[PDB]
Amino acid sequence: KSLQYLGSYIARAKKLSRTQIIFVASYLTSWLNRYVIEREEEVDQRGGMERFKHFYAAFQALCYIFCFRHNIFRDTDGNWECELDKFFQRMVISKFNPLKFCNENVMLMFARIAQQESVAYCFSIIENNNNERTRQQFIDLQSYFPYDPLFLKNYKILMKEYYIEWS
Amino acid sequence: PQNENARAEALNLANTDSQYLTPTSGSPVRGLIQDHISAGVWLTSKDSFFTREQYQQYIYGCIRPEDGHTTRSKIVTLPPTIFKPYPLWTGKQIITTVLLNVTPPDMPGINLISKNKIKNEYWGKGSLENEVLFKDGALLCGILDKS
Amino acid sequence: MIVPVRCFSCGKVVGDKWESYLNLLQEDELDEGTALSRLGLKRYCCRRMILTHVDLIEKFLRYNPLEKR
Amino acid sequence: EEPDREKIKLLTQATSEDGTSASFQIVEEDHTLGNALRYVIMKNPDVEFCGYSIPHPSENLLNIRIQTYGETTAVDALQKGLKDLMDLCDVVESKFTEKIKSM
Amino acid sequence: NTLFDDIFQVSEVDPGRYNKVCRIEAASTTQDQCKLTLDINVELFPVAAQDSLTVTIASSLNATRSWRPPQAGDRSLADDYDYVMYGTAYKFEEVSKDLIAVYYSFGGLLMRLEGNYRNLNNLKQENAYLLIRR
Amino acid sequence: EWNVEKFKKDFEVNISSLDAREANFDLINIDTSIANAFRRIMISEVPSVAAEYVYFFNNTSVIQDEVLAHRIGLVPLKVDPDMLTWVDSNLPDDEKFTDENTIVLSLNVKCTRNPDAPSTDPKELYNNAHVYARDLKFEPQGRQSTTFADCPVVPADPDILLAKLRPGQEISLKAHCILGIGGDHAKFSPVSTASYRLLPQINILQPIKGESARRFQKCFPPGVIGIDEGSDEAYVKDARKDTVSREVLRYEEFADKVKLGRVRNHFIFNVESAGAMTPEEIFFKSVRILKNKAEYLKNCPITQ
Ligand SMILES: [Zn+2]
């Protein structure tokens, strides 16, 4: 929940610096510089992906930034901060198949964004999940977002600026 | 019962499985009683010739990995006892299968010599269906009874 | 009490063939082996029911308090 | 728009990773289609194991278990059987309509 | 491969309280100190008295992992011989010298050979077939 | 491999005797688990109309409340299904029974003292003494009149006695038809008995010519064995005519000359009917319930 709480703090807060959002990706993506060495080797051991519900918890939140923060990290020279259009290519085409263990709605939005700006081309592997596929604790927390657009119309007077709108 | 010092006792001390032998003279008190005992001398009889589709069905009807009875996490079958005309299984080979599949794989098979209450002459010319002989976890000879 | 409506085993309708059954006995002097048979009862589950039926409703109807005497 | 996702309920704790040994638990069933499907699954030569079970006859339960040899998951052998349980009723009706109309 | 091969001569076909299984008894024509005491499913394979068997015990067909029922196009050692079982030898015994008399349990169908040179090539392997031609 | 289009070349149907209450038809070369499943539907899963709900207004008679409530429910009401829809009884009475699920019946019978002259019969001594079940009157509720102009509700067996009444007693109740199936209650059975039996096969072993042929008739039902002489010593005319008696396996002279046993692939389905529907169409309400019991598995998401 805290890796889900952290994911929606960053993409729903307006007064944080653009060098402070890379500070998340200085450690959250660096957390994926640690799973790539250590625990990419238990999958060939006879075991499913039910043990890695901690791992796909935070991996949702990094794609939850990517579904929102897209027009922030341009430069003039046509690059991205630590190759943003190359990091989500590597950790999806691995031998973990995150397309099934991420939600469809969060992959409906990971696909249209990675088609316009040419980030990922996992579309034919999104299509390859009908012949590839207890359970309730992995669908709700891939849909519970702690900073939802609030039903209360009155408290948003105090939070018109410090809470981000859709776009 | 109402707390956890007692729920462990009802699972470890005074449960049914530890009360298999009587504490009087060590005789057993569990066991099938009327239906299956006289039923079992028909499946273990020599004329039991199951076909292919029945053989898994009598196995799967008593063994379910879904409810979690097995140890191997997959129901394994044996080769039939007739090959060339029409492949038929045998009921002694069913008791061979249900000893294969609820017993742990780390230990090897069973070996047992035992008698019956059926005297040998009831089956014809002096055949040996009184001597119930288990070897390597198989019902190789003998019919299963109250004994 | 009265004739049962369906047979207790098969599921064929029985109750319309009880007062239509005594009119093969009080009149034609038939035996039950033809009297049950001429109606249509031909399974013995539904042929030990019209034969056997006690019909004690008549001994109840003599006890009516909704009538003078 | 409504899926009834409670009929073909696939238990997973007795399921192979590759899907060649699947595990169901079918409600609104008993020996009705339990043995009508078990006959038709076992005609598929790829199927290695198919029994249907009932844990307790009181409620509606039908644990069936397909296991295959290779190159076909057990759910892909289920849906051949339910395709060949329907096509039987194509045969039976047009060989029983063709005899009522033939007298 | 083949462990044993002979031709026997049926004398007794005991019906004996069964509807399908008859305890056959026979002895050979080639050798004389060798016999048979075999249960066969006489429903599938009718055996009367005064006949000629061919009791050939093989060790496999011509390691394979899984027994699967036959596909269309293979070739087996069981192709030519009309009735094939499977069983283990569960007891070895010798009556005297060159009168060694083995046992078997062909699935719950007891067999008893007896002889002198079969000590060479009948181990108590858990995979040992049985075959009959003609 | 077993093709299902080889199954069509090994599936024949011999309809023997087709009547509007029973049909006796054959199923050649089908399985004891497919042909059971047809028989498994025709008792239970076929829909048939009866009455669960008996609203008494007035009844003072001898046959009490729940008993005559019971015996109305056992009446096969000649109501064709697919002209009602299914109730949805998860909500209370205000919209539970509609004008489209429920057919509504009423009973009004009053018995009086009829003066008549002579041991005296009860039909002439009283006016309306015996509550026959042709006294059930269809109340057309709602719009059940623009389309019931050729299918009015009549009970299928009208002469069912329901109660016997004495003067003073009356029965006033209101009955509600419910569309049901024969797993819940027996009273929704669409059949008398839809059972099959299986074709026996009698094999002579030794030729039984002469005196062994003439005494061989009396072991069997008659229209089965045909014996003439030494030539035409015996044969079987039709074993379908022969129920399984096994009288011949009492005789010691014949206990080794013959073989009795079924042909395992010739199902003689003889489906009768209670009266609600024809047997030769409730069998079509089992060749199309099976076909629509597979689509509820097939076109359905395999959960988890
Ligand atoms: Zn009956």
From Swiss-Prot, chain A:
Residues of the full protein shown: 419 to 614 of 627
Further comment found in the protein's record: Present with 138 molecules/cell in log phase SD medium.
Name assigned to this protein: RNA polymerase I-specific transcription initiation factor RRN3
Function noted in UniProt: Required for efficient transcription initiation by RNA polymerase I. Interacts with Pol I in the absence of template DNA and stimulates recruitment of Pol I, but does not remain as part of stable preinitiation complex.
Signal peptide: none
Annotated family: Belongs to the RRN3 family.
Subunit-structure text: Monomer. Interacts with NOP53.
Subcellular localization: Nucleus
Coiled-coil residue windows: none
Curated annotation (Swiss-Prot), chain B:
Cellular compartments annotated: Nucleus, Nucleolus
Source taxon at top rank: Eukaryota
Function as written in the Swiss-Prot or TrEMBL entry: DNA-dependent RNA polymerases catalyze the transcription of DNA into RNA using the four ribonucleoside triphosphates as substrates. Component of RNA polymerase I (Pol I) which synthesizes ribosomal RNA precursors. Besides, RNA polymerase I has intrinsic RNA cleavage activity. RPA190 and RPA135 both contribute to the polymerase catalytic activity and together form the Pol I active center. In addition, subunit RPA12 contributes a catalytic zinc ribbon that is required for RNA cleavage by Pol I.
Subunit and interaction comment: Component of the RNA polymerase I (Pol I) complex consisting of 14 subunits: RPA135, RPA190, RPC40, RPA14, RPB5, RPO26, RPA43, RPB8, RPA12, RPB10, RPC19, RPC10, RPA49 and RPA34. The complex is composed of a horseshoe-shaped core containing ten subunits (RPA135, RPA190, RPB5, RPO26, RPB8, RPB10, RPC10, RPA12, RPC19 and RPC40) where RPA135 and RPA190 form the DNA-binding cleft. Outside of the core, RPA14 and RPA43 form the stalk that mediates interactions with transcription initiation factors and newly synthesized RNA.
Family: Belongs to the RNA polymerase beta' chain family.
Additional information: Present with 2840 molecules/cell in log phase SD medium.
Protein name: DNA-directed RNA polymerase I subunit RPA190
Lineage: Eukaryota, Fungi, Dikarya, Ascomycota, Saccharomycotina
UniProtKB/Swiss-Prot annotation, chain C:
Compartments (UniProt record): Nucleus, Nucleolus
Cross-link type Glycyl lysine isopeptide (Lys-Gly) (interchain with G-Cter in ubiquitin), residue numbers: K59
Binding site for Zn(2+): C7, C10, C45, C46
Pfam family, one: RNA_pol_N
GO process terms (BP): nucleolar large rRNA transcription by RNA polymerase I; ribosome biogenesis; RNA-templated transcription; termination of RNA polymerase I transcription; termination of RNA polymerase III transcription; transcription by RNA polymerase I; transcription by RNA polymerase II; transcription by RNA polymerase III
Coiled-coil region: none
Keywords: DNA-directed RNA polymerase, Isopeptide bond, Metal-binding, Nucleus, Ribosome biogenesis, Transcription, Ubl conjugation, Zinc
Cellular component GO terms, alphabetical: nucleoplasm; nucleus; RNA polymerase I complex; RNA polymerase II, core complex; RNA polymerase III complex
A GO molecular function held by the record: DNA-directed RNA polymerase activity
Subunit text: Component of the RNA polymerase I (Pol I), RNA polymerase II (Pol II) and RNA polymerase III (Pol III) complexes. Component of the RNA polymerase I (Pol I) complex consisting of 14 subunits: RPA135, RPA190, RPC40, RPA14, RPB5, RPO26, RPA43, RPB8, RPA12, RPB10, RPC19, RPC10, RPA49 and RPA34. The complex is composed of a horseshoe-shaped core containing ten subunits (RPA135, RPA190, RPB5, RPO26, RPB8, RPB10, RPC10, RPA12, RPC19 and RPC40) where RPA135 and RPA190 form the DNA-binding cleft.
Similarity section: Belongs to the archaeal Rpo10/eukaryotic RPB10 RNA polymerase subunit family.
Swiss-Prot record, chain E:
Signal peptide: none
Lineage: superkingdom: Eukaryota
Pfam families per the UniProt record, alphabetical: RNA_pol_Rpb8 (PF03870)
SUPFAM superfamilies from the UniProt entry: Nucleic acid-binding proteins
Entry-linked InterPro entries: NA-bd_OB-fold, RPABC3
Localization of this protein: Nucleus
Subunit structure: Component of the RNA polymerase I (Pol I), RNA polymerase II (Pol II) and RNA polymerase III (Pol III) complexes. Component of the RNA polymerase I (Pol I) complex consisting of 14 subunits: RPA135, RPA190, RPC40, RPA14, RPB5, RPO26, RPA43, RPB8, RPA12, RPB10, RPC19, RPC10, RPA49 and RPA34. The complex is composed of a horseshoe-shaped core containing ten subunits (RPA135, RPA190, RPB5, RPO26, RPB8, RPB10, RPC10, RPA12, RPC19 and RPC40) where RPA135 and RPA190 form the DNA-binding cleft.
The name this protein goes by in its record: DNA-directed RNA polymerases I, II, and III subunit RPABC3
Gene this protein is translated from: RPB8
